[PDB]
Amino acid sequence: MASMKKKGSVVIVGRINLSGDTAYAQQTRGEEGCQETSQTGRDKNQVEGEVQIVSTATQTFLATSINGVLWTVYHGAGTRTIASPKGPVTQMYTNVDKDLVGWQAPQGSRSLTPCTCGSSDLYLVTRHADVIPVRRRGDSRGSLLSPRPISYLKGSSGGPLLCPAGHAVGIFRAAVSTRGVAKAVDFIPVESLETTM
Ligand SMILES: COc1ccc2nc(C)c(O[C@@H]3C[C@H]4C(=O)N[C@]5(C(=O)NS(=O)(=O)C6(C)CC6)C[C@H]5/C=C\CCCCC[C@H](NC(=O)OC5(C)CCC5)C(=O)N4C3)nc2c1
Numbered sequence: 001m002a003s004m005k006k007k008g009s010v011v012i013v014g015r016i017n018l019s020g021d022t023a024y025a026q027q028t029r030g031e032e033g034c035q036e037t038s039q040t041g042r043d044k045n046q047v048e049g050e051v052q053i054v055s056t057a058t059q060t061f062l063a064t065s066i067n068g069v070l071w072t073v074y075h076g077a078g079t080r081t082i083a084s085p086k087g088p089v090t091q092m093y094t095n096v097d098k099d100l101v102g103w104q105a106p107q108g109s110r111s112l113t114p115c116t117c118g119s120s121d122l123y124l125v126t127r128h129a130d131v132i133p134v135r136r137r138g139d140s141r142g143s144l145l146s147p148r149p150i151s152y153l154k155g156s157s158g159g160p161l162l163c164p165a166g167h168a169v170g171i172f173r174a175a176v177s178t179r180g181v182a183k184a185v186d187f188i189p190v191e192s193l194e195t196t197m
């Protein structure tokens with residue numbers, strides 16, 4: 001019992017900048033600082049933007065602020081705390097049945113607005129700042145207009161699907177593939193988040 005370890009915190013290591021004319025990834029912390037922040041849970045870096053790049057000791061993925069909650073996937077974060085300036089912060093939402101977790105949105109982040117447009121013309125934002133057109137096909141499904149190898153989507157779970165107006169429509173959860181080519185995506189609809197709150 002004395003030699004039992006504690007898993008580290010999720011750590012913000014960068015962001016996807018959607019501010020201006022061009023989307024681009026920014027890194028805010030390197031691997032050594034990430035590993036240390038994961039163990040202490042103390043992250044004093046300023047946070048900005050809507051889409052964060054996050055990492056554990058073993059995985060990296062995305063997390064998206066909607067309505068004052070930083071949302072991501074359970075298969076990335078598990079039940080882990082997130083590092084913050086005052087120490088590890090416990091999850092405010094955990095739903096393994098939805099592959100969904102959330103923490104209070106960090107001070108300085110901006111939140112996306114939940115979409116009420118009812119539009120089926122969506123855009124998936126990846127960890128490489130690709131903005132991928134996706135046609136909505138169901139409550140939790142959308143097809144890529146231009147399929148591509150799943151490699152290009154790996155590490156983007158927790159990223160947003162946006163409507164034409166830039167509202168949040170869902171959180172990227174899984175990729176549907178044939179012969180390694182992603183033809184469709186599975187996502188947590190924003191309404192499932194809004195119900196969870
Ligand atoms: C443990 O407790 C839980 C609870 C509920 C869970 N619920 C789901 C649906 C789940 O699925 C896992 C993880 C997810 C994934 O891989 N997600 C993306 C991703 O990027 N992760 S990641 O960031 O790299 C990483 C791992 C965090 C660091 C976007 C994926 C990108 C590429 C796919 C790669 C090949 C995989 C193709 C696969 N496909 C698929 O399952 O399709 C369907 C059958 C499911 C409905 C249709 C797929 O996508 N996943 C498999 N695990 C759960 C686990």
Ligand SMILES: [Zn+2]
Nearest residue numbers: 115117163167
């Ligand atoms: Zn909208």
